[PDB]
Design an enzyme around this catalytic site. Structure first.
Site, PDB file in Angstrom:
ATOM      1  N   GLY B 240      -6.754   1.572  -8.118  1.00 49.57           N
ATOM      2  CA  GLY B 240      -8.051   1.279  -7.822  1.00 49.57           C
ATOM      3  C   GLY B 240      -8.930   0.297  -7.428  1.00 49.57           C
ATOM      4  O   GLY B 240      -8.141  -0.358  -6.406  1.00 49.57           O
ATOM      5  N   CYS B 268      -0.080   0.499  -6.016  1.00 46.29           N
ATOM      6  CA  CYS B 268      -1.474   0.188  -5.835  1.00 46.29           C
ATOM      7  C   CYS B 268      -1.569  -0.661  -7.311  1.00 46.29           C
ATOM      8  O   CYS B 268      -1.154  -1.771  -7.535  1.00 46.29           O
ATOM      9  CB  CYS B 268      -1.893   0.701  -5.034  1.00 46.29           C
ATOM     10  SG  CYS B 268      -2.910   0.230  -3.985  1.00 46.29           S
ATOM     11  N   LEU B 269      -3.038  -0.678  -7.735  1.00 50.62           N
ATOM     12  CA  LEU B 269      -3.399  -1.397  -8.269  1.00 50.62           C
ATOM     13  C   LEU B 269      -2.530  -1.325  -9.673  1.00 50.62           C
ATOM     14  O   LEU B 269      -1.790  -2.534  -9.982  1.00 50.62           O
ATOM     15  CB  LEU B 269      -4.462  -0.985  -9.004  1.00 50.62           C
ATOM     16  CG  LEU B 269      -5.520  -1.556 -10.194  1.00 50.62           C
ATOM     17  CD1 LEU B 269      -5.883  -3.235  -9.383  1.00 50.62           C
ATOM     18  CD2 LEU B 269      -6.564  -1.177 -11.084  1.00 50.62           C
ATOM     19  N   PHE B 313      -5.603  -7.556  -2.896  1.00 48.00           N
ATOM     20  CA  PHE B 313      -4.702  -7.848  -3.512  1.00 48.00           C
ATOM     21  C   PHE B 313      -3.813  -8.122  -3.195  1.00 48.00           C
ATOM     22  O   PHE B 313      -3.009  -6.629  -2.868  1.00 48.00           O
ATOM     23  CB  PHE B 313      -5.560  -8.205  -4.974  1.00 48.00           C
ATOM     24  CG  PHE B 313      -6.890  -7.988  -4.910  1.00 48.00           C
ATOM     25  CD1 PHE B 313      -6.996 -10.021  -5.437  1.00 48.00           C
ATOM     26  CD2 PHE B 313      -7.822  -7.635  -4.953  1.00 48.00           C
ATOM     27  CE1 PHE B 313      -8.330 -10.089  -6.390  1.00 48.00           C
ATOM     28  CE2 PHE B 313      -8.778  -7.781  -5.339  1.00 48.00           C
ATOM     29  CZ  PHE B 313      -9.137  -8.958  -6.401  1.00 48.00           C
ATOM     30  N   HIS B 352       0.925   3.609  -0.185  1.00 48.73           N
ATOM     31  CA  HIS B 352       0.402   4.141  -1.363  1.00 48.73           C
ATOM     32  C   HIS B 352       1.576   5.473  -0.930  1.00 48.73           C
ATOM     33  O   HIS B 352       0.892   6.405   0.302  1.00 48.73           O
ATOM     34  CB  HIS B 352      -1.745   5.150  -0.582  1.00 48.73           C
ATOM     35  CG  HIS B 352      -2.481   4.097  -0.926  1.00 48.73           C
ATOM     36  ND1 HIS B 352      -2.695   4.713  -2.919  1.00 48.73           N
ATOM     37  CD2 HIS B 352      -2.990   3.205  -1.182  1.00 48.73           C
ATOM     38  CE1 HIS B 352      -3.738   4.168  -2.892  1.00 48.73           C
ATOM     39  NE2 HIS B 352      -3.906   2.941  -2.358  1.00 48.73           N
ATOM     40  N   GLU B 354       1.331   8.775  -1.683  1.00 53.65           N
ATOM     41  CA  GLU B 354       0.133   9.867  -1.858  1.00 53.65           C
ATOM     42  C   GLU B 354       0.037  10.020  -0.484  1.00 53.65           C
ATOM     43  O   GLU B 354      -1.035  11.434  -0.184  1.00 53.65           O
ATOM     44  CB  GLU B 354      -0.538  10.242  -3.039  1.00 53.65           C
ATOM     45  CG  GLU B 354      -1.919   9.234  -2.886  1.00 53.65           C
ATOM     46  CD  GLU B 354      -1.612   7.866  -3.036  1.00 53.65           C
ATOM     47  OE1 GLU B 354      -2.995   7.478  -2.793  1.00 53.65           O
ATOM     48  OE2 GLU B 354      -0.487   7.554  -3.222  1.00 53.65           O
TER      49      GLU B 354
END
Ligand SMILES: [Cl-]
Ligand SMILES: [Cl-]
Ligand SMILES: [Cl-]
Ligand SMILES: [Cl-]
Ligand SMILES: [Cl-]
Ligand SMILES: [Cl-]
Ligand SMILES: [K+]
Ligand SMILES: [K+]
Ligand SMILES: [K+]
Ligand SMILES: [K+]
Lengths: 358, 379, 358, 379
Positions: B240, B268-269, B313, B352, B354
């Protein structure tokens, strides 16, 4: 772009197939496909300035030849594609014959269209804005001069006027994600210049000979490299200008600064303009840079080694004969004929067998 | 002549051509090195509030297609490219880029020195900016808009992109041959995973489904309690936009999950949130990682993978709690890329796995998730 | 569309200029220009079913021939325009040569594009939707059949299946703003039909000769007109089918009902389909209607007067020679030679001078 | 495939293709026989709340251009045509019809049996309808909206399109050679006319200017008093949409001017108004007059003119007051076309002397107006 030499093989089949026939190749870098492609054409050393026409617009048969050339590719195909667009053919038409992706073809059609406007507006319509847009498309000053009916130097002066010069970008493997300490550049018409030429050292520029062809092989390249290596070692800042991808001369390791560009007057003058070298060597890259000597010198370039004039003296069948004469040396009997019946007589004079040089 | 202009906070101006919707756009500006996968990129929800610049000059060569949409819409706040090609040329294309842009009402500009911009971002760090496409775009006003942008640091964007109500996901990955599959049937998927939508990418879900996972997508703010009630085989934390930090609700929830024995996997997030939840800290990077050629080492195995990256981040490795062990690091800068709980069945990846777009090198990260789940079910 | 006869004047200049050379003309009515043009093409009586090709796709010199035909207009230009688009020339390229407004040209291009799909999908691709689209653009069953590689009757069957028949609109001088009691109609593929045929009287259909040409002139139209005036006076309901704008046959006054349509099998069957006449006269419009007689009958039309078979007997040089023979009448000696050397012999038989008839 | 559908009050449906904006349109449906002039027609205020059907199959052949705009916008509620050309082909074109429609946000449909539509309206009289253009046009819904339409009978549309505030017009007519001319300078115009804006066509104004008039455009509802105050050399009542009947304000005012000696000229709606203010009666026509081939006889001279018509309501000849002599009648249906006050310097014309589009035949009607003016000044 591959480099061919079919003219040397008169009785050879010149259509392109699955068995290689090219003797070499040129490479070009551009911020856009159009720019890249045009630069590549002008560095091919075949006398082209971009998409110079092959057939005449008022040739009744033109379409028949174009069709042939498109359906059964020869070395000239790239040029017949643009001729096709000038003749009214469509991108789909060309596609059907060549099988070259429309993505590429549309770009060529667009260029043809711009060429048509240039022809129409003339040098007078070459305003800063338009001139800029054309440069950004990879148009050579020489090509633009042909279309507008002027001397190349006129377009060049005009750019000078509008302060319309390329910028240099650097190759870095990572799309600018990381900084580079290497100086492997290419020209383009953009905003930021990354050349950052030194003010520190004495610079020597070496001009390569573009793509290899029969008579102009790796031998000339070897010399160009040696020059670079020796002078660098000697403490000069060496600058290589060349566009043959197959060579050591285009290996970033070979010089302090490498300009992967077309070895043309236009391209070289732009580099000289910001580098301000101490000297330029034109005698090592073979014919290509040699044919530039006189114009380089004319433009203020500091050509080092044997002068363009001295070169010319040798290369000029007439200047030469005079010198040999002067030196009291031996040369075979010779004459310059104009007409056939002239030759036969002269031939009588000279004596058979004979060496007939175009 | 259809004008457009991009102005950064620093005042730098980029004059170009409008290729999308008329109007203005404001957000953090980023650069992405992906030579392919633009559509996937644009439709990535992680790009919400970001103006995206692509380094590869010709953007839109293969047009666009539904199958290449990673979410319902285009989340990129704006798009910046060097050249918009004359035509799209690919069998799969259904709509040219410009049209699509205009369709999704995106402000986008072409014909600018994207390299100059990239170099600027890399050298001086991220910057907020504004694009104005219109008749006579006002530089001053663009500048104000860019200067007025609040900044992504400390901004909770997850709650903004999340789903209103929960739902079920049972669709698998696309194939050349078949295309996108038809939604499987619930009784066809052995596992049941609960996925927190922090603005989740379709591929992530699709690939989970490929592994035999039936999904329940919940709104970001969903309680751990509400969740547990579902008897999940596992919990997955999506990717996200914005700062992971300000997402109290989720950190708290995760913390709860970590008390249990249920398997947790974040991407990720979600990686970030999992780290926060374990007592680690996050920082906002200089310009971050955005592209598809980023080398990441599996420290354990000493192997390299080329990965798909899109983050501003990162998790600070120096503040890592003992119960958090390092699994992966970037070969580009050494930053933290993966972590596993020493004491729990929980791990995450910054990249990522995916892809979409990108190299498939990291997809095995998923497999490990599945092991945890099967083993959890054994018990 | 004008009607020419250049084949009858070998040594003549067949290029179109400011001096008229045409011997007649056809007219067509359609809701669209596409529809209107194709109907006229098919009604011209030159064997066209629409945009039939003139050159081969795989002819190396095709572009050259097309070009010429475009640049210097002949009687066949219209077909060559379509060939140009098939050959890859753009609308602008065609414009430049012909100066015909692009508004018309794009229209023709679209039709070609549609034909290419037809060729690709074949008869299987001829779903109702598509077929209907095609009909709306005025494509003839014969044209579609050629593209699909089928028989014209197969397309017609296909249409009957889908229930894809044209509707008739009327001419009224005011765009339907006022009603009309006159039945001057034309076919089109639309929703509402205005034919409203009588259930009332016995009808007699008279087929016209289409455009005039050398040999098929006003004389045939004069007969057509008289059949109508006589039978109408005799009490029948007289229906005229013709598309020659120059004639009295196509004057709304001459008959009860006027179908301003191409005199073709397809168009005629459609009228018959809805009118269900008592008889059709095919003996008065010259060659045109004559050649249709057999097919008409086959398809169930009530042809009156001398039978199509009877006609064939007379026109078939073979059948004929037997009948003369049958009747013990005198005929010049004749032969049917295949080869040269066969003729020279046969010719010796027959005796000079000789009347060679292809 | 971009669907579009048109439904009439009677339930009659016409399925075709969308060529304008996505959406719905509701209005009275009318047919126009003009073979040329589609743009001028579209931009005619009188067409407000009306769905325009053109009988000429090919609409859009010449594109569009600013010079061919009769007003600041498109007044037509919708557009119904048979065929939208592939291209626009005219040196004056600046934008294709479809693009133009979209830009003006007009719902338009193509590919329908316009002929059938026309014969229906002629046969059964005007009808209200609705066009729906989108992914899945809902017939029922369309019928609903059509049916629900209030109707133009008794509808005051003049107040709806009239100008907010007064203004001055001093611009003349276009020329092939000079295009639309530069607005004249007040001192250049001999007379000063006051024009009521009931949804005025720019060509009326322009042609007045051509005659040496400097205008002052006033809102529909402007008071005679306020007007008289201006010291007009003449008063003009423009054309406009809706029922003339309900426009009490105007009627009342006109009555006031009629007590004076100031010349008055009304065109179309202004013709009806004049008539009403004189004690006449207006009716709603079966289908009305819309086209540009309409023969109108000047009973006085016994000469015919081909005119541009655009009206749904007419003045009842049988109720005319004796102070109202008949000056012109339609050759098509005998309907009332012109009238002049026996006792005052006031006259009107039902058609459009200004054409645009249309035959210039009726232009001289303006001339008479000038005469009145010049003679009013003499006194
Ligand atoms: Cl060979
Ligand atoms: Cl220009
Ligand atoms: Cl820029
Ligand atoms: Cl053939
Ligand atoms: Cl189809
Ligand atoms: Cl319809
Ligand atoms: K080479
Ligand atoms: K720019
Ligand atoms: K004729
Ligand atoms: K339809």
């Amino acid at each position: 772009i591959p480099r061919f030499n079919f003219e040397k093989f008169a009785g050879a089949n010149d259509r392109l197939t699955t068995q290689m026939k090219s003797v070499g190749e040129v490479m070009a870098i551009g911020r856009t496909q159009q720019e890249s492609l045009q630069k590549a054409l002008r560095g091919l050393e075949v006398g082209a300035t971009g998409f110079d026409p092959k057939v005449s617009l008022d040739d009744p048969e033109a379409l028949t030849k174009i069709r042939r050339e498109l359906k059964d590719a020869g070395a000239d195909r790239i040029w017949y594609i643009a001729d096709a667009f000038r003749a009214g053919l469509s991108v789909d038409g060309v596609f059907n014959l060549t099988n070259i992706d429309r993505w590429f073809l549309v770009q060529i059609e667009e260029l043809v269209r711009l060429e048509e406007k240039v022809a129409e507006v003339g040098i007078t319509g070459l305003n800063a804005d338009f001139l800029r847009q054309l440069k950004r498309k990879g148009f050579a000053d020489a090509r633009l001069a042909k279309l507008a009916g002027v001397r190349e130097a006129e377009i060049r002066k005009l750019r000078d006027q509008y302060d319309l010069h390329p910028v240099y970008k650097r190759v870095d493997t990572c799309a600018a994600e990381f900084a580079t300490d290497t100086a492997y550049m290419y020209s383009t018409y953009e905003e930021e210049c990354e050349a950052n030429p030194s003010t520190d050292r004495e610079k020597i520029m070496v001009l390569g000979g573009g793509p290899n062809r029969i008579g102009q092989g790796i031998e000339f390249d070897y010399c160009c490299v040696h020059a670079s290596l020796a002078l660098r070692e000697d403490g000069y800042e060496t600058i290589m200008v060349n566009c043959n991808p197959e060579t050591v001369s285009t290996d970033y390791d070979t010089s302090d600064r490498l300009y992967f560009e077309p070895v043309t007057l236009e391209d070289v003058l732009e580099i000289v303009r910001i580098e301000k070298p101490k000297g330029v060597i034109v005698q090592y890259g073979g014919q290509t840079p040699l044919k530039l000597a006189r114009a380089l010198e004319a433009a203020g370039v500091p050509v080092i080694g044997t002068s363009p004039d001295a070169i010319d003296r040798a290369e000029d069948r007439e200047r030469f004969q005079h010198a040999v004469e002067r030196l009291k040396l031996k040369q075979p009997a010779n004459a310059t004929v104009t007409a056939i019946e002239m030759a036969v007589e002269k031939a009588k004079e000279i004596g058979y067998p004979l060496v007939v040089r175009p | 002549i259809k004008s457009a202009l991009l102005v950064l906070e620093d005042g730098t101006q980029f004059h170009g051509r409008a290729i999308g919707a008329t109007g203005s756009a404001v957000g953090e500006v980023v650069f992405n090195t992906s030579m392919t996968g633009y559509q996937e990129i644009l439709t990535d929800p992680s790009y919400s509030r970001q103006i995206v610049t692509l380094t590869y000059p010709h953007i839109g060569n293969v047009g666009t297609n539904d199958a290449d949409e990673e979410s319902s819409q285009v989340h990129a706040q704006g798009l910046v490219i060097r050249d918009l090609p004359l035509i799209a040329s690919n069998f799969r294309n259904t709509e040219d880029l410009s049209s699509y842009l205009k369709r999704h009402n995106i402000v986008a500009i072409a014909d600018i020195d994207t390299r100059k911009l990239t170099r600027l971002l890399r050298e001086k760090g991220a910057q907020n900016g504004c694009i104005i496409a219109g008749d006579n775009p006002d530089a001053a006003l663009a500048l104000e808009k860019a200067r007025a942008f609040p900044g992504l640091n400390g901004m909770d964007l997850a709650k903004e992109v999340t789903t209103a109500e929960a739902y079920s996901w049972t669709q698998g990955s696309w194939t050349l041959t078949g295309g996108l599959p038809e939604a499987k049937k619930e009784d066809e998927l052995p596992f049941h995973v609960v996925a927190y939508d922090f603005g989740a990418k379709r591929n992530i879900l699709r690939m989970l489904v490929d592994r035999g996972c039936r999904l329940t997508i919940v709104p970001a703010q969903t309680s751990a309690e509400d969740v547990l009630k579902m008897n999940p085989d596992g919990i997955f934390l999506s990717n996200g936009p914005g700062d992971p930090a300000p997402c109290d609700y989720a950190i708290t929830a995760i913390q709860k999950f970590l008390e249990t024995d249920i398997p947790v996997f974040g991407i990720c997030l979600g990686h970030q949130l999992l780290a926060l939840a374990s007592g680690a800290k996050t920082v906002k990077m200089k310009f971050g990682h955005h592209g598809g050629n980023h080398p990441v080492k599996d420290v354990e195995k000493n192997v390299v993978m080329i990965t798909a990256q899109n983050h501003g981040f990162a998790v600070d490795e120096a503040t890592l709690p003992a119960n958090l062990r390092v699994t992966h690091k970037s070969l580009f800068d050494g930053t933290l890329q993966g972590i596993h709980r020493t004491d729990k069945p929980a791990f995450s990846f910054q990249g990522h796995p995916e892809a979409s777009p990108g190299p498939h090198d990291a997809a095995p990260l998923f497999d490990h998730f599945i092991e945890l789940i099967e083993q959890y079910r054994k018990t």
